[PDB]
């Protein structure tokens with residue numbers, strides 16, 4: 533077995549360099565984690581949600597790691613400290629558990645977001661307050677099992693020992709690294725899916741715009757005016773007869789629908805009405821110049837208006853139409869707010885008016901705050917990936933070839949990044965998370 537002092541390498545000023553960085557970063561990391569752990573339990577709206585149970589569990593795994601790692605790293609390297617032979621297997625095992633639990637905490641946070649975005653109405657039933665804690669425990673137990681194995685019956689006896697960590701073999705590290713790479717593969721595969729489903733909800737085009745405003749329905753419905761309609765506002769007949777509307781439906785689809793149409797039929801019939809709306813605007817002397825100046829987003833906002841009150845109606849908004857052509861967005865936004873169209877349908881008008889001033893689909897963005905929560909995580913996962921890649925790579929190199937004191941020195945400075953990662957992560961939540969930033973004004977006082 534190799535000696536304990538052989539793993540202590542400090543070429544003069546690098547001993548006081550770890551002493552100034554590791555002690556400052558480790559105390560500052562435990563300062564932010566405690567400001568997050570209490571914050572989740574302090575606010576009534578944050579404690580109930582399962583997403584914040586994984587944010588809290590990360591801060592819990594980070595707080596304990598920030599104190600256990602910074603204590604034992606400065607102790608062993610800077611002050612040449614050796615507590616006991618059994619206590620060391622406890623120190624290392626405690627660091628191994630707290631940092632593995634940070635990874636696992638984020639995997640559950642990534643799984644939480646996958647279910648939320650992939651299956652949104654079935655999320656609240658697929659993931660409950662209890663189920664999240666059951667998943668937390670399972671993750672914490674498997675964290676402790678893989679982390680304390682050396683402490684238990686695993687140690688390097690006839691098998692070669694690791695040149696980075698004392699008393700631990702190459703075979704156990706290989707096992708933990710492969711286990712951690714399995715947790716990372718889980719994170720990468722689950723989050724790649726999270727970004728794909730988040731793009732689906734932020735995706736906008738006119739069909740998805742008017743789907744919100746007009747209201748999609750594959751069954752025959754009645755519009756505000758009282759006439760029979762189908763899909764995205766496709767008025768069938770003004771007539772009070774449903775059988776007349778049912779006949780009009782079979783006429784417009786070319787099949788015996790019996791009151792129900794398919795989604796791609798509603799999309800077919802929609803683009804049929806959009807093409808017809810566009811032609812109407814073009815064959816309108818007052819509307820065409822306005823349409824000519826508007827972009828792919830603002831053009832859709834005008835078609836939205838033509839869908840609502842027809843070409844002859846929209847053409848009447850001469851005051852606003854002049855501003856839309858002159859690109860005076862803010863002046864048109866306030867002028868349109870002074871219309872009867874805003875006084876009759878404020879809900880829809882505000883959104884339409886916004887698309888005219890911003891030039892963005894943000895006004896029609898579904899699940900925006902739940903989607904921005906997935907964005908927060910992405911950055912947290914990026915930092916995690918950045919900081920941990922050099923540390924794990926040196927541990928992988930350790931098992932394949934023999935490494936000299938020059939590599940051993942470099943590993944100690946990479947180990948400092950885990951501490952930086954755990955310090956940076958609660959700052960990301962303190963800046964992006966809107967629910968945390970909104971609670972930051974009330975909870976602290």
Ligand SMILES: CC(C)(CCCCCC#N)c1cc(O)c2c(c1)OC(C)(C)[C@@H]1CC[C@@H](CO)C[C@@H]21
Nearest residue numbers: 539604605608623624627628696697708947950
């Ligand atoms: C943060 C981490 C990268 C976690 C790796 C988990 C172990 C893998 C398994 N299974 C890590 C890196 C370290 O360099 C060390 C760590 C933990 O723990 C203490 C107790 C502070 C050690 C003190 C003695 C040093 C000997 O050179 C190694 C120090």
